[PDB]
Amino acid sequence: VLSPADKTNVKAAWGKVGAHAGEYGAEALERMFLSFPTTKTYFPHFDLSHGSAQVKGHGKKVADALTNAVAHVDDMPNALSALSDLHAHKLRVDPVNFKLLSHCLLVTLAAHLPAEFTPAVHASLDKFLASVSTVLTSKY
Amino acid sequence: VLSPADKTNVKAAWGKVGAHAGEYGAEALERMFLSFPTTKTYFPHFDLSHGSAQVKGHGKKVADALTNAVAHVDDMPNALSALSDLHAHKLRVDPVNFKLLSHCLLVTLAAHLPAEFTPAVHASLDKFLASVSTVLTSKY
Amino acid sequence: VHLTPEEKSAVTALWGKVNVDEVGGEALGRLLVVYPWTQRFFESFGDLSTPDAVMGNPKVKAHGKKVLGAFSDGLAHLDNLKGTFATLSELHCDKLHVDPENFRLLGNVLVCVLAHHFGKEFTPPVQAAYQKVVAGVANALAH
Amino acid sequence: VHLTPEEKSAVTALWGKVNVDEVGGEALGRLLVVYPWTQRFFESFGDLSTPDAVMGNPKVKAHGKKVLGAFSDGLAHLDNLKGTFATLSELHCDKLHVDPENFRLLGNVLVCVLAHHFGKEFTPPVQAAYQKVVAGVANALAH
Ligand code: HEM
Ligand code: HEM
Ligand code: HEM
Ligand code: HEM
């Protein structure tokens, strides 16, 4: 459950992220693939090398999903219903992988926005990514 | 996030639990203390022996809270607010301990209701206890 | 796993009354039902949509018999769990890519199944010794 | 922890540019802020209500210097992590009752702090090497 203060923090942080979302998501996916090779088994049809166009496109898709989740923070379960059905019913992704991807997104945000990544902003982003991860792993 | 089906399953299961809630909660607390001794550090003022009146009373309170959560499944954050502030702000309990207590409650329910503990009922109770644990581990 | 003589005697006595052919499959099916993401590893077992189809699966039953036989082999070598579960650890880590938390989940499901099948006989101390046994098994597998 | 020569060279070079006196305390403060249940352990330190009070605590800064010094001692003995962190593991398991997941959380917070301080030169390979290093440290502490 999120408060108003951290919701405002995530909204401001992602608004300041802005148009770099696609490259940030691609870099986060690359970091997840490089540091957690077990997650590579979920993408056997992808080319998982550095600078891959498929990874860049999937990162752009993930970034757009994060942007619309930020826009719909108060009503996540039904705003991300298609993704929840994709990840839980079809893909059957372990929530550990969601935790790893959230950690890699946090690392990317820290490495790209030092002034933006305050300790309060870090906590707000952490629990926002936990809320997106729980919605996408929920099966209902 | 819970579906209507597992919500109905938990409602029926706890309605059939009924008046044995206090004994079941006391036994669950005893099981948690015996199998996970690290949780005993959260109760330094209690007498944690077998058949203890303090443990029986605390189990009765926990069972009453669980019954209230069952009666208020759709609005847990607003129904368990006092307990959320108690466990998250004052007590500051690790969610691992909540997971252990949920597992011990599941073991107690399995040992006391064979006919009631169907595999679907088990899944519904697991998700219900995860939802109560998440509400009591969140900060507002 | 370090256990008292009383705990070891209690664990072995409960294990003798264990109906492996049923309880192993029951534990595997309950894992698949309560934690549906585990069906990714068992998609080759056929129909796993409904709990009744999961519990009526001969492949699930046979795999549960094999998982329980490993649990019995580990119980017979409680002082050598790491060496007993080395080939299985390699198979689960390098070949199957199973997350170690799933081992703890399966151990908890097995404990719940034992409680369901034994009732009052599965007392809080017996549950504690069994929890130590399944934690040791999970740690040996995750190595 | 097994590392390639390139990974070890990258890890050691970044560690030399690390400001211990700052980043150890900042990592501890970020752990306390993002995971507030960890303040149960740090109650002696004093005011830990607001993030600005957590990050401006001399006791938190000193304890973060000690935690980073242990991380440096572990980095200097990457092939003997289990034997290096034996006393710390005993202290954290028997005297402090700290859950092992908190070690992984602190390692992730430290990695985030390193990323925040090193920006672009914290490449994904460096992050992977540091992730497996902190994972080995957490495993040595949890033993
Ligand atoms: C944590 C936040 C996540 C978000 C916001 C997210 C979002 C998305 C989006 C937008 C798609 C595109 C679906 C489509 O184009 O049809 C997708 C697909 C997919 N996701 Fe995620 N995802 C997340 C986590 C994960 C994780 C951690 C994994 C695996 C470790 C994963 C595995 C997949 C896979 C395998 C696909 C299929 C892509 C394809 O077939 O091209 N997801 N996700
Ligand atoms: C579903 C899970 C839980 C429920 C429904 C629950 C419910 C309750 C209730 C009703 C009380 C009584 C508060 C009062 O009388 O003022 C309480 C107190 C308390 N709870 Fe929990 N609790 C849960 C989990 C836990 C766990 C896992 C722990 C520790 C490992 C814990 C630690 C405590 C402590 C230390 C108290 C104070 C009791 C006292 O001071 O007498 N709670 N909880
Ligand atoms: C204490 C926990 C576990 C034990 C003792 C155990 C034991 C075993 C055993 C005895 C086998 C048979 C290997 C063979 O016949 O060569 C096996 C295979 C396998 N295990 Fe496990 N296992 C455990 C946990 C898990 C979990 C939790 C999963 C998945 C979520 C899993 C996935 C698999 C799969 C997919 C196979 C191969 C099945 C097949 O090829 O038909 N294991 N395991
Ligand atoms: C994960 C890597 C960790 C490292 C390298 C580490 C390192 C250390 C060291 C070197 C000490 C000795 C301090 C002294 O002798 O004065 C210490 C003490 C302590 N540790 Fe850790 N620690 C870690 C994780 C944690 C975590 C995650 C927590 C709590 C959530 C924790 C709680 C404590 C506490 C409470 C003390 C005693 C502080 C005091 O008495 O003032 N440790 N740690």
Residue numbers in the entry:
A (entry chain A), B (entry chain C): 1 to 140
C (entry chain D), D (entry chain B): 1 to 143
What does the paper say about this structure?
Here, we present a workflow that utilizes the SPT Labtech chameleon – a next-generation nanospray cryoEM grid preparation device – in an aerobic environment to freeze O2-sensitive proteins under functionally anaerobic conditions, which we term (an)aerobic. Demonstrating the utility of this workflow, we determined high-resolution cryoEM structures of deoxygenated human hemoglobin (Hb) in various liganded states and the molybdenum-iron protein (MoFeP) – the O2-sensitive catalytic component of Azotobacter vinelandii nitrogenase – in a reduced state. Our workflow maintains (an)aerobic samples by protecting against or eliminating O2 contamination prior to loading into the chameleon, during sample aspiration, and throughout sample deposition on self-wicking EM grids, respectively. Finally, we detail the effects of O2 contamination at different stages of the workflow and show how to prevent their effects. Together, we demonstrate reproducible high-resolution structure determination of O2-sensitive proteins of varying complexity and size – as small as 64 kDa – with a workflow requiring only minimal modifications to a robust, widely available EM grid freezing method.
As monitored by UV-Vis spectroscopy, metHb has a Soret maximum at 405 nm, indicating that the heme iron is in an oxidized state (Fe3+) and incapable of binding O2. To eliminate these possibilities, we next assessed the effect of the protective oil layer on grid preparation and downstream cryoEM imaging and data processing using our metHb sample. Briefly, we created two metHb samples – one without and one with the protective oil layer – by placing 15 µL of metHb (~ 125 µM) each into two sample cups. One sample was used without modification (non-oiled), and ~ 70 µL of aerobic Al’s oil was carefully layered over the second sample up to the brim of the sample cup (oiled). Two cryoEM grids of each sample were prepared using the chameleon following recommended guidelines. Both metHb samples were imaged using the same microscope parameters with approximately the same number of micrographs for each dataset collected. We did not observe any noticeable differences neither in the quality of the sample stripes on the grids nor in their behavior during data collection. Both datasets were processed independently but with similar steps and parameters to allow for a direct comparison of the resulting densities. A comparison of our 2.78-Å resolution non-oiled and 2.71-Å resolution oiled metHb EM densities did not indicate any notable differences in their overall quality. Indeed, the view distribution and the total number of particles were similar between the samples, each resolved to a similar resolution and demonstrated similar map-to-model validation metrics. D, E Comparison of metHb densities determined with or without the protective Al’s oil layer detailing no obvious differences in the metHb densities between the sample with oil present or not.
